[PDB]
Short mmCIF file of C-alpha atoms and ligand atoms in Angstrom, two decimals:
data_model
loop_
_atom_site.label_atom_id
_atom_site.label_comp_id
_atom_site.label_asym_id
_atom_site.label_seq_id
_atom_site.Cartn_x
_atom_site.Cartn_y
_atom_site.Cartn_z
CA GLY A 1 60.04 29.65 5.37
CA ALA A 2 57.38 26.94 5.44
CA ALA A 3 57.20 25.00 8.71
CA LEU A 4 55.71 21.55 9.35
CA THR A 5 56.59 19.40 12.35
CA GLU A 6 57.44 15.71 12.11
CA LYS A 7 54.53 13.36 12.73
CA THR A 8 54.01 12.26 16.32
CA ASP A 9 52.02 9.10 17.03
CA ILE A 10 49.25 9.71 19.57
CA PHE A 11 47.27 6.47 19.28
CA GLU A 12 49.37 3.57 18.02
CA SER A 13 47.76 0.59 16.31
CA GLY A 14 49.23 -2.90 16.19
CA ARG A 15 50.82 -4.31 13.04
CA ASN A 16 50.24 -7.29 10.74
CA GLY A 17 46.82 -7.82 12.30
CA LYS A 18 48.32 -8.19 15.79
CA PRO A 19 47.31 -6.25 18.92
CA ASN A 20 49.52 -3.37 20.09
CA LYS A 21 51.35 -3.06 23.41
CA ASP A 22 48.07 -2.49 25.23
CA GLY A 23 46.38 -5.40 23.45
CA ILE A 24 44.50 -3.14 21.06
CA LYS A 25 44.58 -3.80 17.33
CA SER A 26 43.17 -0.53 16.00
CA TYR A 27 42.50 3.16 16.53
CA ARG A 28 40.31 5.24 14.26
CA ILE A 29 38.21 8.39 13.98
CA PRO A 30 40.32 11.31 15.26
CA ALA A 31 38.93 14.37 17.03
CA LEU A 32 41.14 17.31 18.00
CA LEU A 33 40.06 20.08 20.37
CA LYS A 34 41.98 23.12 21.68
CA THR A 35 40.33 24.14 24.98
CA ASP A 36 40.11 27.56 26.60
CA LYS A 37 43.01 26.61 28.85
CA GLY A 38 45.10 25.94 25.75
CA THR A 39 45.04 22.19 26.32
CA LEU A 40 44.89 19.86 23.32
CA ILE A 41 42.43 16.97 23.56
CA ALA A 42 42.90 14.16 21.05
CA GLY A 43 39.94 11.81 20.90
CA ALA A 44 39.56 8.52 19.05
CA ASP A 45 37.83 5.16 18.73
CA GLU A 46 39.84 2.50 20.61
CA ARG A 47 39.03 -0.61 18.51
CA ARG A 48 40.41 -3.55 20.42
CA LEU A 49 39.34 -6.53 18.34
CA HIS A 50 39.79 -5.28 14.78
CA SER A 51 39.46 -2.24 12.53
CA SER A 52 35.82 -2.74 11.54
CA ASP A 53 32.99 -0.38 12.44
CA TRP A 54 31.70 -2.49 15.32
CA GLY A 55 32.89 -4.70 18.18
CA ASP A 56 34.54 -3.63 21.44
CA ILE A 57 35.13 0.08 20.92
CA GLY A 58 35.92 2.60 23.63
CA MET A 59 35.72 6.40 23.42
CA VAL A 60 39.10 7.63 24.64
CA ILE A 61 41.14 10.83 24.70
CA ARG A 62 44.66 12.01 25.58
CA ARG A 63 45.58 15.51 26.76
CA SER A 64 48.58 17.70 25.92
CA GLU A 65 49.39 20.77 28.00
CA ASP A 66 52.44 21.82 25.96
CA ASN A 67 50.66 22.35 22.65
CA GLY A 68 51.23 18.86 21.30
CA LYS A 69 54.81 18.23 22.42
CA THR A 70 53.91 15.61 25.02
CA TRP A 71 50.68 13.79 25.89
CA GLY A 72 49.30 12.29 29.08
CA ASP A 73 48.01 8.76 29.53
CA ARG A 74 44.82 7.68 27.78
CA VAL A 75 41.55 8.68 29.43
CA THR A 76 38.52 6.48 28.77
CA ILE A 77 35.23 8.34 28.45
CA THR A 78 32.96 5.35 27.85
CA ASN A 79 33.63 1.67 27.16
CA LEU A 80 30.65 -0.70 27.46
CA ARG A 81 31.34 -4.28 28.48
CA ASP A 82 31.10 -7.07 25.95
CA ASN A 83 28.53 -9.86 25.94
CA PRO A 84 30.56 -12.72 27.56
CA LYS A 85 28.24 -15.27 25.95
CA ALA A 86 28.21 -13.94 22.37
CA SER A 87 28.96 -16.66 19.82
CA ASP A 88 31.10 -14.38 17.63
CA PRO A 89 33.34 -12.03 19.70
CA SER A 90 34.13 -9.84 16.70
CA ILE A 91 30.49 -8.70 16.78
CA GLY A 92 29.47 -9.59 20.33
CA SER A 93 29.69 -6.28 22.08
CA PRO A 94 27.47 -3.21 22.50
CA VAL A 95 29.06 -0.50 20.37
CA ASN A 96 30.13 3.14 20.71
CA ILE A 97 31.61 4.63 17.58
CA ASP A 98 32.58 8.02 16.10
CA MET A 99 32.82 11.08 18.34
CA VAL A 100 32.44 14.82 17.96
CA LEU A 101 34.21 17.10 20.44
CA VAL A 102 33.38 20.71 21.24
CA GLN A 103 33.60 23.13 24.17
CA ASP A 104 31.06 25.76 25.22
CA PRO A 105 33.07 29.04 25.34
CA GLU A 106 30.97 30.41 28.19
CA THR A 107 30.52 27.48 30.60
CA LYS A 108 33.79 25.84 29.49
CA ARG A 109 32.01 22.47 29.47
CA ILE A 110 33.58 20.02 26.98
CA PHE A 111 31.19 17.72 25.12
CA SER A 112 31.82 14.38 23.43
CA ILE A 113 28.86 13.15 21.40
CA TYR A 114 29.09 9.70 19.83
CA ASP A 115 27.06 6.80 18.42
CA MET A 116 25.71 3.91 20.41
CA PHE A 117 24.45 0.56 19.12
CA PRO A 118 23.32 -2.43 21.17
CA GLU A 119 25.31 -5.63 20.55
CA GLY A 120 25.78 -6.15 16.83
CA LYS A 121 27.43 -5.04 13.64
CA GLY A 122 26.67 -1.35 14.05
CA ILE A 123 25.37 0.55 11.03
CA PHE A 124 26.02 -2.59 8.96
CA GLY A 125 23.78 -4.78 11.10
CA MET A 126 20.63 -2.71 11.45
CA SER A 127 17.33 -4.57 11.26
CA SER A 128 14.91 -4.09 8.36
CA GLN A 129 12.08 -3.61 10.84
CA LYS A 130 11.75 -0.74 13.27
CA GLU A 131 11.44 -1.20 17.03
CA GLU A 132 10.10 1.66 19.18
CA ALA A 133 12.86 2.74 21.54
CA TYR A 134 10.95 5.11 23.84
CA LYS A 135 7.46 5.50 25.24
CA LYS A 136 5.83 8.61 26.73
CA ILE A 137 3.98 8.31 30.03
CA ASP A 138 2.43 11.33 31.75
CA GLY A 139 4.80 13.74 30.04
CA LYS A 140 7.69 11.41 30.85
CA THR A 141 9.90 9.76 28.23
CA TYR A 142 11.14 6.32 29.29
CA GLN A 143 13.39 3.92 27.41
CA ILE A 144 11.67 0.70 26.34
CA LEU A 145 12.73 -2.86 27.16
CA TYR A 146 11.65 -5.88 25.14
CA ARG A 147 11.12 -9.39 26.46
CA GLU A 148 11.04 -12.45 24.18
CA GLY A 149 7.59 -13.98 24.14
CA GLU A 150 5.82 -10.74 24.97
CA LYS A 151 4.60 -8.01 22.63
CA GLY A 152 4.17 -5.35 25.28
CA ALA A 153 6.83 -2.76 25.93
CA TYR A 154 8.40 -2.69 29.40
CA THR A 155 9.94 0.60 30.54
CA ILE A 156 12.92 1.79 32.58
CA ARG A 157 11.78 4.39 35.09
CA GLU A 158 13.14 6.19 38.15
CA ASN A 159 16.10 4.51 39.86
CA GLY A 160 16.24 2.17 36.87
CA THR A 161 13.22 0.22 38.08
CA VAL A 162 11.76 -1.86 35.29
CA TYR A 163 8.00 -1.51 34.83
CA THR A 164 5.70 -3.97 33.06
CA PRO A 165 3.76 -2.95 29.94
CA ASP A 166 0.68 -2.60 32.19
CA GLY A 167 2.36 -0.03 34.42
CA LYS A 168 3.43 -2.19 37.37
CA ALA A 169 6.85 -2.19 39.01
CA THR A 170 8.93 -5.37 38.92
CA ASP A 171 11.89 -6.69 40.88
CA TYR A 172 14.16 -6.00 37.90
CA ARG A 173 16.40 -2.95 37.74
CA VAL A 174 18.80 -1.41 35.25
CA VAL A 175 22.06 0.31 36.16
CA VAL A 176 21.17 3.80 34.96
CA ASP A 177 23.87 5.43 37.13
CA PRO A 178 27.05 3.41 36.37
CA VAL A 179 30.02 3.78 38.70
CA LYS A 180 32.68 1.44 37.31
CA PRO A 181 35.72 2.73 35.40
CA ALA A 182 34.62 3.69 31.85
CA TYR A 183 31.05 3.06 33.05
CA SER A 184 31.28 -0.54 31.81
CA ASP A 185 28.40 -1.41 34.11
CA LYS A 186 25.92 0.82 32.29
CA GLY A 187 22.87 -1.17 31.23
CA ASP A 188 23.49 -4.05 33.63
CA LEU A 189 20.23 -5.84 34.39
CA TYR A 190 19.57 -7.02 37.92
CA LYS A 191 16.79 -9.11 39.43
CA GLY A 192 16.62 -8.26 43.10
CA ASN A 193 20.30 -7.99 43.99
CA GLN A 194 21.64 -10.53 41.50
CA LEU A 195 23.18 -9.51 38.18
CA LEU A 196 21.47 -11.32 35.29
CA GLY A 197 22.83 -9.67 32.17
CA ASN A 198 22.73 -6.39 30.27
CA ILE A 199 19.99 -4.58 28.31
CA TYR A 200 22.50 -3.88 25.53
CA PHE A 201 23.07 -7.57 24.81
CA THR A 202 21.15 -8.89 21.80
CA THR A 203 22.23 -12.55 21.56
CA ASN A 204 22.64 -15.55 23.87
CA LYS A 205 21.04 -13.39 26.58
CA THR A 206 21.08 -14.39 30.23
CA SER A 207 18.48 -11.77 31.23
CA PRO A 208 14.92 -11.25 29.91
CA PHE A 209 15.33 -7.67 28.70
CA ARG A 210 16.95 -5.66 25.93
CA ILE A 211 16.54 -2.18 24.49
CA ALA A 212 15.23 -1.61 20.98
CA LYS A 213 17.64 -2.63 18.23
CA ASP A 214 18.38 0.77 16.72
CA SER A 215 20.94 3.57 16.26
CA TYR A 216 21.42 5.87 19.28
CA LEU A 217 23.28 9.09 20.14
CA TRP A 218 25.06 9.46 23.49
CA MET A 219 26.77 12.39 25.19
CA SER A 220 29.39 12.69 27.92
CA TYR A 221 30.85 15.96 29.20
CA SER A 222 33.79 17.22 31.20
CA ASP A 223 34.00 20.33 33.40
CA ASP A 224 37.65 19.81 34.29
CA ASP A 225 39.38 20.30 30.96
CA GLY A 226 38.97 16.67 29.90
CA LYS A 227 40.36 14.91 32.97
CA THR A 228 37.08 13.31 34.07
CA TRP A 229 33.82 12.67 32.27
CA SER A 230 30.20 12.28 33.28
CA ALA A 231 28.18 9.10 32.82
CA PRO A 232 26.72 8.76 29.30
CA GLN A 233 23.50 10.61 28.55
CA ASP A 234 21.15 9.29 25.85
CA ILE A 235 20.17 12.32 23.76
CA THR A 236 18.59 10.22 20.98
CA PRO A 237 14.97 11.10 21.97
CA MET A 238 15.68 14.82 21.61
CA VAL A 239 16.77 14.65 17.99
CA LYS A 240 15.89 11.35 16.33
CA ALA A 241 12.68 11.41 14.29
CA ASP A 242 10.45 8.36 14.03
CA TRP A 243 11.37 7.83 10.37
CA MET A 244 15.10 7.88 10.92
CA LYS A 245 16.89 4.55 10.64
CA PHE A 246 20.53 5.48 11.30
CA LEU A 247 21.37 8.80 13.07
CA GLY A 248 25.05 9.33 13.78
CA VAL A 249 27.60 12.08 14.11
CA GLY A 250 29.94 13.36 11.42
CA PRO A 251 33.18 12.65 13.41
CA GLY A 252 35.59 15.43 14.31
CA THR A 253 35.21 18.74 16.10
CA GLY A 254 32.01 20.74 16.30
CA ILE A 255 31.72 24.49 16.67
CA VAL A 256 29.93 27.21 18.59
CA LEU A 257 28.61 30.11 16.52
CA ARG A 258 30.68 33.27 17.07
CA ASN A 259 28.30 35.80 15.53
CA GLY A 260 24.81 36.49 14.27
CA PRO A 261 21.32 36.02 15.79
CA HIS A 262 22.32 32.49 16.77
CA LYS A 263 25.66 33.27 18.41
CA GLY A 264 26.43 30.76 21.15
CA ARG A 265 24.68 27.90 19.38
CA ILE A 266 26.58 24.60 19.51
CA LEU A 267 26.61 22.74 16.15
CA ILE A 268 27.27 19.03 15.79
CA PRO A 269 27.51 17.50 12.29
CA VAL A 270 25.30 14.38 11.94
CA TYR A 271 23.78 12.30 9.14
CA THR A 272 20.91 9.90 8.74
CA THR A 273 19.62 7.07 6.62
CA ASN A 274 15.96 6.18 5.97
CA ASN A 275 14.08 2.87 5.69
CA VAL A 276 13.60 3.24 1.95
CA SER A 277 17.21 2.94 0.78
CA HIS A 278 19.33 3.06 3.96
CA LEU A 279 23.05 2.99 3.09
CA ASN A 280 22.42 2.59 -0.63
CA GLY A 281 20.94 5.99 -1.33
CA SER A 282 19.64 7.91 1.67
CA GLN A 283 22.71 9.09 3.62
CA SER A 284 21.94 12.76 4.32
CA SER A 285 23.94 15.38 6.25
CA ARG A 286 22.49 17.86 8.74
CA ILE A 287 23.35 19.18 12.17
CA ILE A 288 21.92 18.96 15.67
CA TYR A 289 22.26 21.99 17.93
CA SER A 290 21.93 23.41 21.40
CA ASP A 291 21.09 26.96 22.42
CA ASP A 292 21.14 26.26 26.14
CA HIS A 293 24.77 25.26 26.54
CA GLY A 294 24.23 21.57 25.89
CA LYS A 295 21.23 21.07 28.17
CA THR A 296 18.88 20.15 25.33
CA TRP A 297 19.44 19.33 21.68
CA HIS A 298 17.43 19.87 18.52
CA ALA A 299 17.69 18.55 14.99
CA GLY A 300 18.09 20.92 12.07
CA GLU A 301 16.72 20.02 8.63
CA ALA A 302 18.69 17.87 6.17
CA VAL A 303 20.54 19.52 3.31
CA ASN A 304 18.57 17.07 1.10
CA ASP A 305 15.14 18.10 2.42
CA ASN A 306 13.24 19.58 -0.52
CA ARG A 307 16.43 19.51 -2.56
CA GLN A 308 15.99 19.56 -6.34
CA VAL A 309 17.60 16.56 -8.00
CA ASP A 310 17.07 16.02 -11.72
CA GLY A 311 13.98 18.21 -11.89
CA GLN A 312 12.24 16.67 -8.88
CA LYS A 313 12.17 17.34 -5.14
CA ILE A 314 13.51 14.78 -2.68
CA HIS A 315 13.46 14.42 1.12
CA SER A 316 16.04 12.74 3.37
CA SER A 317 13.29 10.44 4.72
CA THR A 318 12.22 9.08 1.32
CA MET A 319 15.16 9.51 -1.06
CA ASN A 320 16.83 6.72 -3.02
CA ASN A 321 19.59 8.47 -4.96
CA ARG A 322 23.21 7.41 -4.52
CA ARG A 323 24.81 10.55 -5.98
CA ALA A 324 22.53 12.91 -4.03
CA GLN A 325 23.85 11.51 -0.77
CA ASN A 326 25.99 13.52 1.64
CA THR A 327 27.28 11.80 4.77
CA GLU A 328 29.87 12.80 7.35
CA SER A 329 30.60 16.52 7.33
CA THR A 330 32.52 19.36 8.93
CA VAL A 331 30.93 22.67 9.88
CA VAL A 332 32.24 26.24 9.82
CA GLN A 333 30.67 29.64 10.45
CA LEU A 334 31.75 32.62 8.35
CA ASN A 335 32.11 36.20 9.55
CA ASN A 336 29.01 37.15 7.54
CA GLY A 337 26.96 34.85 9.78
CA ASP A 338 26.59 32.06 7.22
CA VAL A 339 27.15 28.43 8.12
CA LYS A 340 29.04 26.23 5.65
CA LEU A 341 28.79 22.45 5.68
CA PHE A 342 31.47 20.53 3.79
CA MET A 343 29.99 17.11 3.13
CA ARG A 344 31.64 13.80 2.25
CA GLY A 345 30.01 12.54 -0.95
CA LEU A 346 30.21 10.60 -4.21
CA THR A 347 30.67 13.38 -6.80
CA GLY A 348 34.47 13.16 -6.75
CA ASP A 349 34.81 16.73 -5.53
CA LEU A 350 34.08 18.96 -2.54
CA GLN A 351 30.37 19.54 -1.89
CA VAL A 352 29.33 22.44 0.32
CA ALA A 353 25.92 23.51 1.62
CA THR A 354 25.13 26.95 3.11
CA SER A 355 22.82 27.92 5.95
CA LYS A 356 21.54 31.46 6.57
CA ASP A 357 19.64 30.60 9.76
CA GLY A 358 22.15 29.05 12.15
CA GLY A 359 22.14 25.63 10.53
CA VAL A 360 18.42 24.85 10.57
CA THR A 361 17.62 25.04 6.86
CA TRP A 362 19.89 24.85 3.83
CA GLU A 363 19.96 26.95 0.65
CA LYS A 364 19.18 25.37 -2.70
CA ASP A 365 22.65 25.84 -4.17
CA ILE A 366 24.97 22.98 -3.18
CA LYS A 367 28.29 24.10 -4.64
CA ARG A 368 30.96 21.71 -5.90
CA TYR A 369 34.64 22.67 -5.97
CA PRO A 370 36.66 20.72 -8.57
CA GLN A 371 39.74 22.31 -6.97
CA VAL A 372 39.31 20.02 -3.96
CA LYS A 373 39.06 16.31 -4.76
CA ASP A 374 36.94 14.03 -2.54
CA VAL A 375 37.64 10.27 -2.64
CA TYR A 376 34.64 9.59 -0.34
CA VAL A 377 36.23 9.94 3.08
CA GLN A 378 35.81 12.18 6.13
CA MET A 379 37.33 15.67 6.18
CA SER A 380 37.74 18.54 8.63
CA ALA A 381 37.73 22.29 8.10
CA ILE A 382 38.19 25.32 10.33
CA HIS A 383 37.66 29.06 10.11
CA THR A 384 40.75 31.20 10.61
CA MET A 385 41.89 34.82 10.38
CA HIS A 386 45.25 36.00 9.09
CA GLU A 387 46.37 39.61 8.77
CA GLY A 388 42.79 40.85 8.84
CA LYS A 389 41.71 38.42 6.09
CA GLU A 390 39.21 35.58 6.52
CA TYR A 391 40.15 32.07 5.41
CA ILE A 392 39.13 28.42 5.71
CA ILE A 393 41.55 25.52 6.07
CA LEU A 394 40.30 22.10 4.97
CA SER A 395 42.13 18.79 5.10
CA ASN A 396 41.41 15.47 3.42
CA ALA A 397 42.91 12.79 1.19
CA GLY A 398 44.28 13.90 -2.16
CA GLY A 399 43.82 10.52 -3.83
CA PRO A 400 43.82 8.41 -5.94
CA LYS A 401 42.44 6.51 -2.94
CA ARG A 402 42.61 7.30 0.79
CA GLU A 403 46.16 8.58 0.56
CA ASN A 404 48.29 11.70 0.11
CA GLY A 405 46.88 13.93 2.82
CA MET A 406 46.29 17.49 1.70
CA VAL A 407 45.67 20.80 3.48
CA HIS A 408 43.59 23.16 1.33
CA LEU A 409 43.43 26.92 1.88
CA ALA A 410 40.46 29.03 0.82
CA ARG A 411 39.78 32.76 0.96
CA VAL A 412 36.32 33.71 2.26
CA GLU A 413 34.63 36.87 0.93
CA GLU A 414 31.87 39.04 2.41
CA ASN A 415 29.21 37.19 0.43
CA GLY A 416 30.44 33.91 1.85
CA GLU A 417 31.91 32.64 -1.41
CA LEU A 418 35.05 30.51 -1.34
CA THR A 419 38.19 30.83 -3.45
CA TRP A 420 40.72 28.00 -3.19
CA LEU A 421 44.25 29.42 -3.18
CA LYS A 422 46.57 26.59 -2.13
CA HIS A 423 46.70 22.80 -1.87
CA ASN A 424 49.71 21.47 0.03
CA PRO A 425 50.60 17.86 0.91
CA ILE A 426 51.06 17.00 4.58
CA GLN A 427 51.41 13.21 4.64
CA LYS A 428 52.46 10.73 1.97
CA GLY A 429 51.04 7.23 1.87
CA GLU A 430 47.78 6.19 3.51
CA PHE A 431 45.68 9.05 4.82
CA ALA A 432 42.06 9.08 5.93
CA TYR A 433 40.07 10.79 8.69
CA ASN A 434 41.49 13.93 10.25
CA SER A 435 40.71 16.81 12.60
CA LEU A 436 42.12 20.36 12.40
CA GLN A 437 42.50 22.96 15.16
CA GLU A 438 43.94 26.48 15.32
CA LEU A 439 46.65 26.66 18.01
CA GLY A 440 47.27 30.39 17.80
CA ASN A 441 50.23 32.63 16.93
CA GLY A 442 49.75 31.56 13.32
CA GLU A 443 50.08 27.84 14.08
CA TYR A 444 47.66 24.97 13.48
CA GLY A 445 47.41 21.34 14.50
CA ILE A 446 45.98 18.23 12.91
CA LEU A 447 45.23 14.72 14.18
CA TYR A 448 44.89 12.19 11.33
CA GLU A 449 44.72 8.56 10.28
CA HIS A 450 47.77 7.04 8.62
CA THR A 451 49.58 3.69 8.40
CA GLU A 452 53.02 2.45 7.37
CA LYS A 453 55.45 -0.44 7.98
CA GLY A 454 52.47 -2.79 8.16
CA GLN A 455 50.51 -0.91 10.81
CA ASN A 456 46.85 -1.79 11.30
CA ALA A 457 44.28 0.81 10.19
CA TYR A 458 44.95 3.21 11.69
CA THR A 459 47.62 4.95 13.75
CA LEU A 460 46.51 8.47 14.69
CA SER A 461 49.39 10.94 14.44
CA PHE A 462 49.74 14.64 15.15
CA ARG A 463 51.47 17.39 13.19
CA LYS A 464 51.71 21.16 13.54
CA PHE A 465 52.16 23.77 10.79
CA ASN A 466 52.11 27.54 10.34
CA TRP A 467 50.91 30.00 7.71
CA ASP A 468 54.17 29.69 5.76
CA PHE A 469 53.26 26.05 5.18
CA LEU A 470 49.77 27.08 4.06
CA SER A 471 50.58 29.81 1.55
CA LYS A 472 54.08 29.72 0.04
CA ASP A 473 54.79 26.82 -2.33
CA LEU A 474 56.59 23.88 -0.71
C1 LIG Q 1 29.04 4.71 12.40
C2 LIG Q 1 30.04 4.21 11.35
O1 LIG Q 1 30.00 2.95 10.83
N1 LIG Q 1 30.98 5.07 10.99
C3 LIG Q 1 32.03 4.69 10.02
C4 LIG Q 1 31.73 5.22 8.62
C5 LIG Q 1 30.36 4.73 8.14
O2 LIG Q 1 30.38 3.30 8.12
C6 LIG Q 1 30.08 5.21 6.72
O3 LIG Q 1 29.96 6.64 6.73
C7 LIG Q 1 28.77 4.61 6.21
O4 LIG Q 1 28.57 4.92 4.83
O5 LIG Q 1 32.69 4.68 7.70
C8 LIG Q 1 34.00 4.73 8.06
C9 LIG Q 1 35.03 4.89 6.96
O6 LIG Q 1 36.24 4.76 7.26
O7 LIG Q 1 34.63 5.14 5.81
C10 LIG Q 1 34.45 4.64 9.51
C11 LIG Q 1 33.39 5.22 10.45
O8 LIG Q 1 33.66 4.83 11.80
#
């Protein structure tokens, strides 16, 4: 008989707009990862001030060693301190938002890659004008600092020493090696031995320096099964092109290729916007990857690059076409070596791109599956084997709006084609972002967004189900 466990709340939001027991109003953006040790890591955005995509947001996780039955206390990966002088608290804090979790099967290192924005309104507060964020000097990439009244770009060098645009050291220094809990001291700006402010503050500043106002990508990793995490690493320069406006991850759980010429490659879903149409018509999915176990990262090409739309070719850097957009996505590798990218879009149904070269380039045929509705919200999908047959499990809202969570089952053939077999409900009422993981022995787990009884968006809950729940009619 079909089996589905009762929902268990992992990250509890407050209700009626009030903070929860820990003084936090909202939780969002679930990530679920089953590690080599069998541990379950549930990650999420800890949105203290409100549910919006900005403000004071920490990257946190909880661990379960009994396959989801019980969970340990919250573990904070990164939580930047707010600007104590910001006029509007709701938007007065440097921001981290949306994470992707994944573990290297060989080194066992667990990665959490997430967005970073200096103080502001995140993706909804990006400037119309670009500001250079890095500058190369003698084969050395340094992060730039701007000072009001001066056009020249200062730079942060060894030991966090701030250098003038002319190449001279100053008495200013940045905390590049934070040591406080959650690394809340990262970016602190000192003059001599006195703390003046923070390079991530953009308003009512007390120090002379700030980084470029742009979208960044950070990475933290754990070598102890998620118990402790390293200080944030800025990987933005390795993958963000000069034309890119926004560059962020497609939240959830990434993968490591299991077969093919690119086996071992780590894939992280991401998406960008350009300066032509930004959020109106340029959101384009793609992936970033690492072939050296997370040491260095590289950007693949966008699904939209050289894509044919209405008889004409477009590019992710210049496009202005609402319906041709593809944003957050989930990635899966098939046994035939192909990489499938299920992308959140505006067609009303499931859009999927296919890569034959480890995720670098994408084939011309972007298939749509009317069998799986898409109300324009994040989704997750995972590869799975059952009785010698290859399948794909995908979960997302069934509609009309972000509600009625569904778990779709598809059969994968040798040519990589998909055949949707079943569509079973898993959660009534509100349902949004989710993250699926195979637990083994025919069981699966899912961390998802849901609310009820007046809960703030959202409360992240966990459920487990087996094959009987997937196939047989409920
Ligand atoms: C970085 C960021 O803002 N991510 C947010 C995402 C984004 O705003 C959208 O993809 C832009 O089109 O939207 C949503 C959402 O619930 O729909 C929550 C995500 O945290």
